[PDB]
Amino acid sequence: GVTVIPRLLGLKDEKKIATTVGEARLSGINYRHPDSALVSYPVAAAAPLGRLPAGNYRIAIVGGGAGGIAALYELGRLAATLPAGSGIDVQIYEADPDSFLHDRAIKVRGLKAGRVSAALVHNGDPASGDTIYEVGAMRFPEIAGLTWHYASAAFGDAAPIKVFPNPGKVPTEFVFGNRVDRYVGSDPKDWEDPDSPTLKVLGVVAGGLVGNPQGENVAMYPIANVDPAKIAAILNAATPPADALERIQTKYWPEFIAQYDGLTLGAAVREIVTVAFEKGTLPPVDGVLDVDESISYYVELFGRFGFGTGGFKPLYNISLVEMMRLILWDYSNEYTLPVTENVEFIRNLFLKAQNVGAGKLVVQVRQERVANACHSGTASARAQLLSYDSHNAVHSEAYDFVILAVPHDQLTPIVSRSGFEHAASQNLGDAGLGLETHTYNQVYPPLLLSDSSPAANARIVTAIGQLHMARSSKVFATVKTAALDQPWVPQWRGEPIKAVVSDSGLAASYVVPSPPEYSSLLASYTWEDDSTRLRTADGMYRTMVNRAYRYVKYAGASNAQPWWFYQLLAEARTADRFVFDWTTNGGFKLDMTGDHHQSNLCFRYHTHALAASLDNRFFIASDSYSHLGGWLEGAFMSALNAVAGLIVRANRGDVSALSTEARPLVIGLRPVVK
Amino acid sequence: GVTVIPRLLGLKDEKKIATTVGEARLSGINYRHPDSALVSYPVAAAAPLGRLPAGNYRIAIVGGGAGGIAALYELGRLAATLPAGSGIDVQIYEADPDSFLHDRPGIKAIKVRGLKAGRVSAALVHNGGDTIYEVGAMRFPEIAGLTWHYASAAFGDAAPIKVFPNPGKVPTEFVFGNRVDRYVGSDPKDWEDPDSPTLKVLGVVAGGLVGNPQGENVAMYPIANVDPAKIAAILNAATPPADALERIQTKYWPEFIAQYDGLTLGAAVREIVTVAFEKGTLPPVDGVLDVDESISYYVELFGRFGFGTGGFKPLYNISLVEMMRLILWDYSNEYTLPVTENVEFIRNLFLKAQNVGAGKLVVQVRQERVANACHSGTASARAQLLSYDSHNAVHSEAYDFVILAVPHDQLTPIVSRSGFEHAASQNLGDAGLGLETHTYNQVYPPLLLSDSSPAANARIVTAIGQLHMARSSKVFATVKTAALDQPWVPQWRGEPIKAVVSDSGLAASYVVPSPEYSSLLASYTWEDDSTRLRHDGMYRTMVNRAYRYVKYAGASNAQPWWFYQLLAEARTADRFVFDWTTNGGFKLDMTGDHHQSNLCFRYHTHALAASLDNRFFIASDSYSHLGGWLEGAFMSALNAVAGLIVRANRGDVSALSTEARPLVIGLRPVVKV
Ligand SMILES: Cc1cc2nc3c(=O)[nH]c(=O)nc-3n(C[C@H](O)[C@H](O)[C@H](O)COP(=O)(O)OP(=O)(O)OC[C@H]3O[C@@H](n4cnc5c(N)ncnc54)[C@H](O)[C@@H]3O)c2cc1C
Numbered sequence A: 001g002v003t004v005i006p007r008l009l010g011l012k013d014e015k016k017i018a019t020t021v022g023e024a025r026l027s028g029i030n031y032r033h034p035d036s037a038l039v040s041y042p043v044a045a046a047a048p049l050g051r052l053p054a055g056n057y058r059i060a061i062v063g064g065g066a067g068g069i070a071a072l073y074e075l076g077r078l079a080a081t082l083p084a085g086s087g088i089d090v091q092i093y094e095a096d097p098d099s100f101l102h103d104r105a106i107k108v109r110g111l112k113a114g115r116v117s118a119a120l121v122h123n124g125d126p127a128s129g130d131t132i133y134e135v136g137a138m139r140f141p142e143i144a145g146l147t148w149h150y151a152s153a154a155f156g157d158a159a160p161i162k163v164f165p166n167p168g169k170v171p172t173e174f175v176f177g178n179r180v181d182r183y184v185g186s187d188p189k190d191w192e193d194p195d196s197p198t199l200k201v202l203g204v205v206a207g208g209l210v211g212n213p214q215g216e217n218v219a220m221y222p223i224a225n226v227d228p229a230k231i232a233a234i235l236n237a238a239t240p241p242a243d244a245l246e247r248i249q250t251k252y253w254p255e256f257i258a259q260y261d262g263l264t265l266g267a268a269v270r271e272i273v274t275v276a277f278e279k280g281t282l283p284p285v286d287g288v289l290d291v292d293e294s295i296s297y298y299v300e301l302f303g304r305f306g307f308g309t310g311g312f313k314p315l316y317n318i319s320l321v322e323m324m325r326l327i328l329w330d331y332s333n334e335y336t337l338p339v340t341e342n343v344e345f346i347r348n349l350f351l352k353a354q355n356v357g358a359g360k361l362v363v364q365v366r367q368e369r370v371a372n373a374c375h376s377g378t379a380s381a382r383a384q385l386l387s388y389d390s391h392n393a394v395h396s397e398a399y400d401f402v403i404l405a406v407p408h409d410q411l412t413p414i415v416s417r418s419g420f421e422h423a424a425s426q427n428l429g430d431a432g433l434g435l436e437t438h439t440y441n442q443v444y445p446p447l448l449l450s451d452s453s454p455a456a457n458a459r460i461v462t463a464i465g466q467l468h469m470a471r472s473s474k475v476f477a478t479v480k481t482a483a484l485d486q487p488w489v490p491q492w493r494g495e496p497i498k499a500v501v502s503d504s505g506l507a508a509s510y511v512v513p514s515p516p517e518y519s520s521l522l523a524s525y526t527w528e529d530d531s532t533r534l535r536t537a538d539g540m541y542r543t544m545v546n547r548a549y550r551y552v553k554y555a556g557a558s559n560a561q562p563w564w565f566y567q568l569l570a571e572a573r574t575a576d577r578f579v580f581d582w583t584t585n586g587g588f589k590l591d592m593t594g595d596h597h598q599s600n601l602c603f604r605y606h607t608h609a610l611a612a613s614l615d616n617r618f619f620i621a622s623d624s625y626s627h628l629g630g631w632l633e634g635a636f637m638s639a640l641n642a643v644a645g646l647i648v649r650a651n652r653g654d655v656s657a658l659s660t661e662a663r664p665l666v667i668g669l670r671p672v673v674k
Numbered sequence B: 001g002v003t004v005i006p007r008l009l010g011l012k013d014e015k016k017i018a019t020t021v022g023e024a025r026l027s028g029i030n031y032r033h034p035d036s037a038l039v040s041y042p043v044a045a046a047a048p049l050g051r052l053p054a055g056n057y058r059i060a061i062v063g064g065g066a067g068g069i070a071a072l073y074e075l076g077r078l079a080a081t082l083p084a085g086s087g088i089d090v091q092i093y094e095a096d097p098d099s100f101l102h103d104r105p106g107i108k109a110i111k112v113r114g115l116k117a118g119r120v121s122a123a124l125v126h127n128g129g130d131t132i133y134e135v136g137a138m139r140f141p142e143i144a145g146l147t148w149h150y151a152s153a154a155f156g157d158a159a160p161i162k163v164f165p166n167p168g169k170v171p172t173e174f175v176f177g178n179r180v181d182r183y184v185g186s187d188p189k190d191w192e193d194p195d196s197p198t199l200k201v202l203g204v205v206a207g208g209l210v211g212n213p214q215g216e217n218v219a220m221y222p223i224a225n226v227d228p229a230k231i232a233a234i235l236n237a238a239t240p241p242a243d244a245l246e247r248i249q250t251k252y253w254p255e256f257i258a259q260y261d262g263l264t265l266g267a268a269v270r271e272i273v274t275v276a277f278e279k280g281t282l283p284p285v286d287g288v289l290d291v292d293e294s295i296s297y298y299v300e301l302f303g304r305f306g307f308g309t310g311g312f313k314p315l316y317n318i319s320l321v322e323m324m325r326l327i328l329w330d331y332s333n334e335y336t337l338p339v340t341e342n343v344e345f346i347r348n349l350f351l352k353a354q355n356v357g358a359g360k361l362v363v364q365v366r367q368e369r370v371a372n373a374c375h376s377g378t379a380s381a382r383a384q385l386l387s388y389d390s391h392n393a394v395h396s397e398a399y400d401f402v403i404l405a406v407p408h409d410q411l412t413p414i415v416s417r418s419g420f421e422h423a424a425s426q427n428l429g430d431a432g433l434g435l436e437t438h439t440y441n442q443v444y445p446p447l448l449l450s451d452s453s454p455a456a457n458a459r460i461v462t463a464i465g466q467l468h469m470a471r472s473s474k475v476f477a478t479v480k481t482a483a484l485d486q487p488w489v490p491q492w493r494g495e496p497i498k499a500v501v502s503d504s505g506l507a508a509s510y511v512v513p514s515p516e517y518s519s520l521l522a523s524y525t526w527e528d529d530s531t532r533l534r535h536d537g538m539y540r541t542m543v544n545r546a547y548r549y550v551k552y553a554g555a556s557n558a559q560p561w562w563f564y565q566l567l568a569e570a571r572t573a574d575r576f577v578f579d580w581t582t583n584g585g586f587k588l589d590m591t592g593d594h595h596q597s598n599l600c601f602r603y604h605t606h607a608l609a610a611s612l613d614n615r616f617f618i619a620s621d622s623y624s625h626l627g628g629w630l631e632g633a634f635m636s637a638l639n640a641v642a643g644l645i646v647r648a649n650r651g652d653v654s655a656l657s658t659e660a661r662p663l664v665i666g667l668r669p670v671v672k673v
């Protein structure tokens, strides 16, 4: 997802760096997000979420990504508490033929858990395996409590982790227009030019967006009349005051949303810069630029710099609300897991789910694509799924409960083609693909919010269908580690520059750890519009290298030469150059202005379980239905919601079936039903 | 581009429909855009833009799209005014092997389909001799004065034109969530349900964005404290007070930008709906939805409906300023040209350019890709272009002036890789592709705004590189025309329904004018709508989205949508997917983008600074305030040639015609003079 570190500190000499799963798990155990400010999800997840009545349940999970697998794990924790004679049967549907779930020696590489997967690229060298480049989930914030919670389930607290060397955490070169900086962190003493305008605009914009944890409030967009930095401290507290979290949940965060959800991040940056320029805090850029040109230069300069770990420019259209969520979720470091491939995290969680079930959870995998979900009739197994196998044969199955653990663009066709009210019958399936249909009687929509309002039912489906997928592309290569020591590679702070943030088209480029003779280079990580500007792997790689072929003037040398980084990219080994272009080939929800109302409806959907007679058997579980798209943390939160709702539904609306700690997952939100 | 028709009228019985090029040309001849409010570009273009000193000029145009070819035409008009012994030689670079420029334009009998003029082209689909589907420009607003001006040059005023049957102008089915409507236009008498909430939100949002031209002001975002409709009438007037135009240009429009360029269209819609809902001007959706769900339902309902010609939802991130430009450029109809393929417009303009040159313009075409531009050396011709031919051989050539007629993502590598100040020597070219470079000495950037401020030079380059390209995809099929008269195709206002606007994934679908067979634009999607189906085969995915149960008001049992069968029945051999992601975009400004696009729009004013001696101009819809319309490409071309004239006269604006002068001096200059 989007790395947002307001007050960037260099890694060198930074203290309190976590070295195990357990150490990271502790850092975010208390953090509560502002849309769910009554509950720490890691605390909710510390014990089984609640209790089910005695019975033999049949549940489906559609999707084997982080969402579906965390939901499975929570169902295992529940299963274990059932009495003798009782248990849960789960059918997990996963259409992806390369899913870890369908893997039947040596460990098979390159398996997927949805958007957690690595590309396996031939390198030539027979003494090594294939080169591995992670194309989805890569690194995990210290504050990601629920993620580290599940990592402990998967690997144990003792398992070692390594720090991720982001841009700005290590010596970095930044290039925007005519401006060049070399830097680490945000202390002027660690900038090659301590008087840099980049450092000046960083201070102004971080000050205006985040403000200060102590003393006077200096931020432009307060929450509860104070700086966001002060609110973040409350949300992260082990033991905040009576009613403080309630008031954030019901008053002050909704008031911030009401005021600022129609304001983009780029618009907010410009408002801050304009005030600082008028105040004289930001000086004219030089003796030539007019007022608007100066302000615009600073806005764009900030745009490419961000907070120092890569630019926010391509994210300028996101709502200030969405940016503010990330600002509140404050951290200094991200870490990698002790795995060869990150799919191992989700696979280990799947295996652990079965373990914690204590024999009361039985799982069966189906290599089938779900085409339709609906309710049929009013009896006990009223949740229907219509699916197709690898031979395109149709299958229909009925369940007590279903968790739809697929992101929004994949969920749409499953939930939107059965209308919005009761129907005497429907012939469902993929008729346009020429596939067999199946007739269902007394059909109700799957995402059933009302027995009397088709508009209510339409709202959830139309909301899902209009969420925004943020897109990104990555270009990977492998370079001799010694290349970083060529005489033409500059050094800063006693180290070769290994990270580059630039307006060249590459956006962000850096050496990535090996979870050595060779080093992995993320030659380009581009977001949104930056991912389509340049529109054989080596051929495509050369087009990117050609963008780096630019003359760069440095304050040192009187004659500009081709950028050194061009020469570094050209040192990349030829065999294992790899382009992950989303438009030829990974997207996650990131909210635009006005999108809160759609994403938050999804977030709260599981509260339908409070309405007993509605008897809706479908829950949703994905980072698409969270307020942290682009992070496993969001997928995991949504799965925790889904299973908390399922428990309440199983108990006919009785919230006392949830644990004391889990209860606010449902009752701490505005319900979606009367 | 984006069709924006606030007060949509059905085509049936509509009066004042233009029937020739000339009639359309006269309709939009006076309109002035708010960022150039002192000048009607068609009026400026009525005569040659100015005069050049005697000489034999060597000019390059990079790009043979609408921008480059309009620029060529204006250079022809200029050339004809030169004295005996004087002239203009133009080298036109066009890298596209499928360009009309490389297929013997005006020296061909067989009539080859599928040739391109940049983002104007049609796909040729073999059907069993072929089927043509426009994938770029094909319909022109009545108010597009400069477009119709050049259509006149290309075809004559007498050339016939045909009205384009947009969704909403003809009987249309609309589906959003649980809501279905069958309608034509905005008059509730032509709606199947005149009490539709869609009609209610239409009125409220069109009211709040556009307001009322005569009488009481009802808009939420005023310009000069009045409704935008009132400002539109001033900008379109034949002879409004000069001082009124000046105050729009210098005060009222800039103040609108200062206030609202940080507000997206979607945000503005929600503000309007929230106020109306709170006041009770919008009624309850039903007895169940709470206040925020109701407001949200209405915002999203409006999002899918737009003003009646397709949804604005996928454009909700655009700046309100950008939307407002389209609201001010008010019209009721768009028209098609008397062509088989729209490339014929640009080809005809190219041939006319040579004609109007009166023999004083000579034009040569290079099938070469330009990789770099710069100023270098000490000769009179200091504008350098570095290019590669089809054998990847490097070529360098110097010119007196250059017009860079390519959109912003294509311009970036040409202007951004040589730094931002004087350099002693540089090896320019595509070194990363393994191609040969060429050494230039005493090098200055091509887009030279300052001899002392690298920041000023960086601003124009960085601005170009951060413009937003709006994306779209189209899926076309051919159906038997008689299918449309069958019982299973619904009728409204005496006509089969031939247009559908929906949240199905297809977004907008309609019959397009080409008979036994009809062309169906099965799906036209913008921005996020163009990627929702990402996860003849692709055509089937779309038919599958249309396989959805639709409940209509009444006693009828819900059945699969009728439109499924129309799409299912399309001839197989003719289905065509034009998916931008596997296969043209245009500039559409986000919030804050004005400061970047307007710098590009004003760039040609550098010609006012005599000593600067910058020989490069830019010409594309990317450097206009009407991205996605030929009107914008043409406006930028007019800017480029006006600036070129001023530069060729060492800053002397009196070399421009009286009517063209404001093209340069009506804008805030980009240089100190
Ligand atoms: C490029 C990018 C960068 C990222 N960076 C980070 C990061 O820094 N840190 C971090 O923690 N996370 C990161 N992530 C975010 C993380 O990858 C996601 O939050 C998470 O993997 C999403 O899990 P999910 O269960 O919501 O959905 P998915 O991973 O999309 O899983 C959905 C599954 O359902 C299956 N499926 C879909 N439709 C059907 C159907 N109709 N029938 C049955 N099966 C179906 C799919 O095949 C898939 O396996 C990144 C992801 C991407 C896109």
Ligand SMILES: Cc1cc2nc3c(=O)[nH]c(=O)nc-3n(C[C@H](O)[C@H](O)[C@H](O)COP(=O)(O)OP(=O)(O)OC[C@H]3O[C@@H](n4cnc5c(N)ncnc54)[C@H](O)[C@@H]3O)c2cc1C
Residues within 6 Å of the ligand: B001, B062, B063, B064, B065, B066, B067, B068, B093, B094, B095, B096, B099, B117, B118, B119, B120, B135, B136, B137, B138, B139, B140, B147, B368, B369, B370, B371, B405, B406, B407, B410, B414, B472, B584, B585, B586, B619, B620, B621, B622, B627, B628, B629, B630, B631, B632, B633
């Ligand atoms: C999908 C879509 C819908 C549209 N709808 C309409 C409409 O409704 N009505 C209307 O009026 N207009 C419409 N247009 C808008 C119209 O197409 C454009 O405004 C116009 O065609 C753009 O012209 P241009 O000269 O700016 O650029 P382009 O058409 O992009 O031309 C640039 C030319 O330069 C060439 N070139 C690029 N790089 C180089 C290089 N380095 N070396 C040399 N040659 C190079 C290209 O090959 C190209 O031929 C539509 C376009 C598209 C995208």
